[PDB]
Amino acid sequence: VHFKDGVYENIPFKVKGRKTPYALSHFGFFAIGFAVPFVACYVQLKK
Amino acid sequence: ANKVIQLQKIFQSSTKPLWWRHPRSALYLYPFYAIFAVAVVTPLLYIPNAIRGIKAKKA
Amino acid sequence: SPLHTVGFDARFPQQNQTKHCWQSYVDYHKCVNMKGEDFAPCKVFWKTYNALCPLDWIEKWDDQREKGIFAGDINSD
Amino acid sequence: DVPTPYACYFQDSATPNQEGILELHDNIMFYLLVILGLVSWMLYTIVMTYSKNPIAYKYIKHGQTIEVIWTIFPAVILLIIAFPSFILLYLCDEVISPAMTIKAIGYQWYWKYEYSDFINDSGETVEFESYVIPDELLEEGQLRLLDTDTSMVVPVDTHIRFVVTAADVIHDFAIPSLGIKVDATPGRLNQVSALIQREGVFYGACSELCGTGHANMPIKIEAVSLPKFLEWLNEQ
Amino acid sequence: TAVNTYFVEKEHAEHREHLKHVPDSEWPRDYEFMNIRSKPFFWGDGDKTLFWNPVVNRHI
Amino acid sequence: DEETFEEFTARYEKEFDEAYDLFEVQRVLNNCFSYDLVPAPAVIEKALRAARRVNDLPTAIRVFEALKYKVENEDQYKAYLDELKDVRQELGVPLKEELFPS
Amino acid sequence: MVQRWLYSTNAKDIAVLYFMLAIFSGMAGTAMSLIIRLELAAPGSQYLHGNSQLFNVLVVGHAVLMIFFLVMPALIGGFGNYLLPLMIGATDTAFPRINNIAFWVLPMGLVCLVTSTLVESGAGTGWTVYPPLSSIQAHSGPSVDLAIFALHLTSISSLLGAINFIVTTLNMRTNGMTMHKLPLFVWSIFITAFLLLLSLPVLSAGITMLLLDRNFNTSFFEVSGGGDPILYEHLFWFFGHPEVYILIIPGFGIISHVVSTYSKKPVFGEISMVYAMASIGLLGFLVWSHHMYIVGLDADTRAYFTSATMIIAIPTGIKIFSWLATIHGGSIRLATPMLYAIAFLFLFTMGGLTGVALANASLDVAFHDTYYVVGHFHYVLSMGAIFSLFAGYYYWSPQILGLNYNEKLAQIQFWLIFIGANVIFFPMHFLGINGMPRRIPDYPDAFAGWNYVASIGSFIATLSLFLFIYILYDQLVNGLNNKVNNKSVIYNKAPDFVESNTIFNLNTVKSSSIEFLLTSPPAVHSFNTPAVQS
Numbered sequence A: 001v002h003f004k005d006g007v008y009e010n011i012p013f014k015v016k017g018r019k020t021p022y023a024l025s026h027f028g029f030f031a032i033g034f035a036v037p038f039v040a041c042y043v044q045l046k047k
Numbered sequence B: 001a002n003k004v005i006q007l008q009k010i011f012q013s014s015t016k017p018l019w020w021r022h023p024r025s026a027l028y029l030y031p032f033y034a035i036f037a038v039a040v041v042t043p044l045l046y047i048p049n050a051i052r053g054i055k056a057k058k059a
Numbered sequence C: 001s002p003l004h005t006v007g008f009d010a011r012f013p014q015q016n017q018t019k020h021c022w023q024s025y026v027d028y029h030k031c032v033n034m035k036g037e038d039f040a041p042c043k044v045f046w047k048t049y050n051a052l053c054p055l056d057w058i059e060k061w062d063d064q065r066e067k068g069i070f071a072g073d074i075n076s077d
Numbered sequence D: 001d002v003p004t005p006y007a008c009y010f011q012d013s014a015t016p017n018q019e020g021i022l023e024l025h026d027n028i029m030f031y032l033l034v035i036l037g038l039v040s041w042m043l044y045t046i047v048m049t050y051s052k053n054p055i056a057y058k059y060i061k062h063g064q065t066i067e068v069i070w071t072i073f074p075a076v077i078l079l080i081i082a083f084p085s086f087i088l089l090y091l092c093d094e095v096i097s098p099a100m101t102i103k104a105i106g107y108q109w110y111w112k113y114e115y116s117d118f119i120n121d122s123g124e125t126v127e128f129e130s131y132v133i134p135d136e137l138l139e140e141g142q143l144r145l146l147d148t149d150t151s152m153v154v155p156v157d158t159h160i161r162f163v164v165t166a167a168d169v170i171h172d173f174a175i176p177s178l179g180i181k182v183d184a185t186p187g188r189l190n191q192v193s194a195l196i197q198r199e200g201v202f203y204g205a206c207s208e209l210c211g212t213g214h215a216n217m218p219i220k221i222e223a224v225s226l227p228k229f230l231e232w233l234n235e236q
Numbered sequence E: 001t002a003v004n005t006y007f008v009e010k011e012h013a014e015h016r017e018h019l020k021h022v023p024d025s026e027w028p029r030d031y032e033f034m035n036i037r038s039k040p041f042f043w044g045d046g047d048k049t050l051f052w053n054p055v056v057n058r059h060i
Numbered sequence F: 001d002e003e004t005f006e007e008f009t010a011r012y013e014k015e016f017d018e019a020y021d022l023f024e025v026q027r028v029l030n031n032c033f034s035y036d037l038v039p040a041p042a043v044i045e046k047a048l049r050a051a052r053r054v055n056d057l058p059t060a061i062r063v064f065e066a067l068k069y070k071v072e073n074e075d076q077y078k079a080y081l082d083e084l085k086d087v088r089q090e091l092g093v094p095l096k097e098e099l100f101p102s
Numbered sequence G: 001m002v003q004r005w006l007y008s009t010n011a012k013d014i015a016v017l018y019f020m021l022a023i024f025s026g027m028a029g030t031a032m033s034l035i036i037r038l039e040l041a042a043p044g045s046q047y048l049h050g051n052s053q054l055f056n057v058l059v060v061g062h063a064v065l066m067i068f069f070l071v072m073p074a075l076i077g078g079f080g081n082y083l084l085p086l087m088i089g090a091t092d093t094a095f096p097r098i099n100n101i102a103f104w105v106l107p108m109g110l111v112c113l114v115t116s117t118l119v120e121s122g123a124g125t126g127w128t129v130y131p132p133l134s135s136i137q138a139h140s141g142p143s144v145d146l147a148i149f150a151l152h153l154t155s156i157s158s159l160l161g162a163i164n165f166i167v168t169t170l171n172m173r174t175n176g177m178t179m180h181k182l183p184l185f186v187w188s189i190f191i192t193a194f195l196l197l198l199s200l201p202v203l204s205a206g207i208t209m210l211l212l213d214r215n216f217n218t219s220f221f222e223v224s225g226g227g228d229p230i231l232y233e234h235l236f237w238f239f240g241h242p243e244v245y246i247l248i249i250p251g252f253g254i255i256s257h258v259v260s261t262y263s264k265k266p267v268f269g270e271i272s273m274v275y276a277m278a279s280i281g282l283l284g285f286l287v288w289s290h291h292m293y294i295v296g297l298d299a300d301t302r303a304y305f306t307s308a309t310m311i312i313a314i315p316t317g318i319k320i321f322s323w324l325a326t327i328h329g330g331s332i333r334l335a336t337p338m339l340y341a342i343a344f345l346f347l348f349t350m351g352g353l354t355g356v357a358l359a360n361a362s363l364d365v366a367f368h369d370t371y372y373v374v375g376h377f378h379y380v381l382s383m384g385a386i387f388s389l390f391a392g393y394y395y396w397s398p399q400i401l402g403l404n405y406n407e408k409l410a411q412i413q414f415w416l417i418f419i420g421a422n423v424i425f426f427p428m429h430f431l432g433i434n435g436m437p438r439r440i441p442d443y444p445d446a447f448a449g450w451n452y453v454a455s456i457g458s459f460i461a462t463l464s465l466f467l468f469i470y471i472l473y474d475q476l477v478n479g480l481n482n483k484v485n486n487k488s489v490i491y492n493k494a495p496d497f498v499e500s501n502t503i504f505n506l507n508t509v510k511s512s513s514i515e516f517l518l519t520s521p522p523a524v525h526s527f528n529t530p531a532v533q534s
C-alpha cells in the first residue's frame, strides 16, 4: 500500500502489455468519446 | 476469551487475504452474487435482441 | 377607448392580479342576489370585472352557480 | 417588426416605453463600452510595455488613499447610472390611464387570445383560435414559424393592458417590437401596461419551454386603421 | 398532556367507523377537486388499485 | 505604507559584513534593484565592491549595464552617463566598445 | 494492486481519477454539443428527423452533463485534496471512506442518468425542472426519478467533500500559520465549501420534495390543487447563483496562485481582498433573486433586488484591477499560463459588462428571456470554467507528473480554442439585438450565416479537443524526450537581469509553498513532519 514512488504509476492504468500498449484501451476511449451521442441518436432516430 | 487469543495467534502465524473469517458466508454470497446477478441482469437487455437490428428504414 | 376609461389604477396598481377577481365579484354577487330590484350602489366598477379581470373566470363562476356546484372555496351564506 | 437576416439594428419601436428603455439602455451600453475600452487599453499597454520589462517591482501593496478612491468610484458610477434606471422603473411599473384590455391564455403547444373587452355584436365576447402552420401546410403565402392560423389585431393609439395567464404550462407572450414579455403561470395572473403608437405588423414566438410542440407556437400580431380594427372586432 | 390527548382522541376521533354505510344526504359540497381522471393502472388483480381501500370513492 | 527604505540598506551592509560568497551579492543586488529607489553613488560603490570582493568582472558588467538600464525614471540619461563615467574611471572596466558594435 | 484505484486512501489517486471522469464527461458533452449545433447549423431536418422531444432531450443532456460532471468534480476535488491539506503541513487527509463512498455512489448517478436519457419518453425540460413543465404527463417513464437520484447522490458527494475540506482547514492547521494571512486559494476554497454547505441542502430538500410529488402523487407545486412551484423556482435560484459562485471562485483562487507564483510580485491588496472575498461569501445569500423580476413581485422588491445586485458587483472590478496591478510593474513571460489568464480575464470583463447591462430591472422587461441573457451566461460560464480548467491543467501537469508538455502544441491549442470562442461569441450581440428565439429545433432561416459560423467555431473546438487528446498521447509517449530537449518548457519563470546562471540554477523557484520543489508525488505517507513557517 506504500510502494508507489510516483513517477509513472500514478495513472490508473497499466503501461505494460503487448496486446494493449496504450493502443487498444485508448482506441476504446476514442470510440466511447462519440459512442454515447451516436447511440442516443440511433435509439430513436438515424445518424 | 479462550478463542480470541487462538484466533489472534492463527492470524499472526498465517497472514492471508479474505480475512479467513466468513468462508461459508463467502460461498453463499459471491458465487450466488455472480450467477444470480447474471440471471437477473442479462434478460433485461436480452429481450430486445429479437427487436435489435433497427436501421431506421421506412417505406 | 380614447386612452382613458377608468383613469389611474386604484383597485390594484400592481402587475400581479391573482387575488383580484374574487373580491371584485363577491360584492357584485352580494348586491345582485339580495333583492333583485336596485343595483345602483354596485353600478360603478363594471370595468373592474369586465376588462381588468378576465371574463373566463367570471363565466366559469356563472356556469358553476347555474349548475349548483361551485369550485371556489366560498361560503353558502 | 420582423426578424431579418444579417440585421444590424433593433426593430422599430412600437410603444413609448420601448423607445425610452432602448434609449436608456443605449446610454448604459455607451458607458459600458467606454469602460471596456478603458480596460482594453490597460491590458494592451501593460502587456506591450512589460513584454520586455527590465525590473519587477515588489513593494507596492495598498496605497490606501488612492485605493479607496477607486473603491468609491464604482459606487458613485453605479448610483449615477441607476438614477435614470430608478426613474425609468418607477415610471414603467405604474399604469397611467389604461383604456382597454386584451388577454392571451394559450393552451399547450399553441396560442389562444381573448378579446373580451370588445363586444362582437351585443354583449357577447370576441374569441378566436390560432394554430401553427407546419411544412406540409406551408403553401404559397405563408411563412414557416412566422405565420399562424389567425393574426392578433391591436387597437392603435390606445392604452392596453395584457392580462396574461396560462392553463397547463407557462407560456411566454413575446412581442419584441412592443417591448412586452411576461411568463404566464397557469395558476397565476399577470398584467402589464403598454400602448401601440404606429400601424404595422409584428411577429413573436414562445420564449419559454412548453413541451414536444414548444417550437411550433408562434405569435403573429398586426396593426390596422381604427375603423378597420373596430369592424374586425365587430364581425368576429 | 398524554392522558388528555388520549381522552380527546377516544372521544372526537371515533365517528368515522360508520362512514362506510351512510345515506347520500349530508355529503360535502365537492367539485372538480375530486372525481377526476388519472393514469390508467394495470398492475395487480384486485379492483386494479394500488391498495385495497374501497372507501376513497363512494361513487360507483 | 511608505515604509522606511534605509532599513533595507542597513540590512544590505550587515549582510555584507556576513557575506560569504557571490550568492549574497546576487541577492542584495536583486533586492536593491527591485525597489523603486534609485541607488546613490555611495550604495552603488558598495554593491560594486561587494561584487569585486570575489573579483568577478562579469558581475561588474552586470551591475554597470543594470545601472544603465535599471529604471526608466522618465528617461534619465545625463545623470546615468556621468555616474557610469565616474564608476568606470574609479577602477576601469571597458566593455561598451564590444557589445555596442554588434 | 487494485485497492489503489478502488480504495485509494490517498488524495492524489482520487484527484487524478476525478480528473479522468470529468475529462471524459467533458469530451462526451463537447461531441454531443457539436452534434446539436450541427442540427442547428441549418433550419429543417438534415441529420435528425425533427423530433423536438429528442431535441430537448439532448439539450438537457448537454446542460446537465457539463454542469454536473465536467465543471464540478475535478476542478474542486483535485485542487483541494492536492493543495489544501498538503501545503498546510498535514501528513495525510482524513475520511478516505467518505471519498470512496462518494466515488462508488457516483456510478449510480451515471448509469441512472444514462438510462433516463436513453428511454423513449425521457426528461427534456432543460436545466429548469419547475413543474408543471417537468410534469410526468409529458416526460413519462423513470427519467425524472433517475435524474432526482443522480442529483441527490452528487449533492451528497459534494457536501461530504466540502465537509472534509472544512474540517481539514479547521483542525489540521500547522502551529506556525496565522489565519488572517492565509493564501487566496485557501480562502477561496473555504468560501466555496461554506457556500456549498449552505446551498446544496436547500436544493436537495427541493429535489426530494419533487420526488415525493412524482412518486406519491401529492399536490405541492402542481398548478392544480393550489400549489406554488415558485417556491421550488426560488430554491433552484438560491442553488444556482451560489452554485455559480462555487464554480467561479476556485477559478479566481487558481488564477491568483498562478499570477503570484509567476509574476514574482505580491498581489495588490491581498489581505484587503481576502476580507472582500469573505464579505462576498457572507453576502451571497442576498443577490440570488435578480432573475425573477417578471414573476410578479412588488416594485419595492424589484428595487431592493436590483440595489443588492449592483451593490455587490464592485468586487469583480476590484479583482480585475488588483490582478492588473499584480501583472503591473513586474515581469510577464510569453508562457501559456500568462495568455490563458489574460484571455480569461478579458472575456470575463466582457461577461461582467453584459451582466451589468442586465443588472437594470427596467431594461429587463424587454431584455429578459431574449437572446442576450443566454449569451451572457454562456459567456461567463464557458470562459470561466473552460479556461480555468485549461490553465489549471497546463499549469499543474508538471507539478503532478513531472513530465514536460510541449510549448508549441499548447500554444496552437490555445489559439484554436480562442479563435473558436471569439468567432462563436462575437455575433451574439447582433443575435441578441435582433431577438433570436431560444430553444427552437427549427429556427427561422434569417440567422443562417450566424448559425454557420457558430457551427464552424464548435467544430474548431471539437478538433481542438482532438488536439487535447493527441497532446495527452504525445506527453505520455515522449515525456522523456521533452525532458531531454528544449521542445517543452523546462522552468515556470524566466530569470531577471539580476541573476547569475548558477544562482538561478540553484534558486529556480522562490514561491510561497514547497509543492513546486516537492518531488513527483511520493508514496501514501508524505509530509511526515509538520511544516514550520515564520
Ligand code: HEA
Pocket: G019, G022, G023, G026, G027, G030, G033, G036, G037, G040, G059, G060, G062, G063, G066, G067, G071, G074, G125, G126, G127, G128, G378, G381, G382, G383, G385, G386, G389, G390, G393, G438, G439, G440, G458, G461, G465, G468
Ligand atoms: C457550464 C456552462 C456551460 C458551458 C461551458 C456551455 C458551453 C456551451 N454551450 Fe451551453 N448551455 C448551458 C451551459 C453551458 N454551455 C446552459 C445552462 C444551457 C441551457 C440549458 C437548457 O435550457 O437546457 C445551455 C444551452 C445551450 C444551447 C441551447 C440548446 C438549444 O435549445 O438548442 C446551446 C445551443 O447550441 C449551447 C451551446 C454551447 C456551446 C457551443 C458551448 C461551448 O462553449 C462548448 C465548449 C466547451 C469545451 C471547450 C469543453 C472542452 C472539453 C474538454 C475535454 C475539457 C478538457 C479539460 C480538462 C479536464 C483539462 N448551450
Ligand code: HEA
Pocket: D035, D036, D074, D075, D077, D078, G244, G248, G290, G291, G292, G293, G309, G310, G312, G313, G314, G316, G317, G320, G349, G351, G352, G353, G354, G355, G356, G357, G358, G359, G360, G364, G367, G368, G369, G373, G376, G377, G380, G381, G384
Ligand atoms: C461567472 C458568473 C457570473 C457573473 C460574474 C455574472 C455577472 C453578473 N450578472 Fe449574471 N448570470 C450568470 C452568471 C454570472 N453573472 C448566469 C448563469 C445567469 C443565468 C441565470 C438565469 O438568469 O437564468 C446570469 C444572468 C443574469 C441576469 C438574468 C437576466 C434576466 O433577468 O433574465 C442578470 C440580471 O440582472 C444578471 C446580472 C449580473 C451582473 C449585474 C453581474 C455583475 O456582477 C458583473 C460584474 C462585472 C462588472 C462590474 C464589470 C467589469 C468591471 C467594471 C467596469 C467596474 C466598474 C463598473 C461598475 C461597478 C458599474 N446575470
Ligand SMILES: [Cu+2]
Pocket: G241, G287, G288, G289, G290, G309
Ligand atoms: Cu446574482
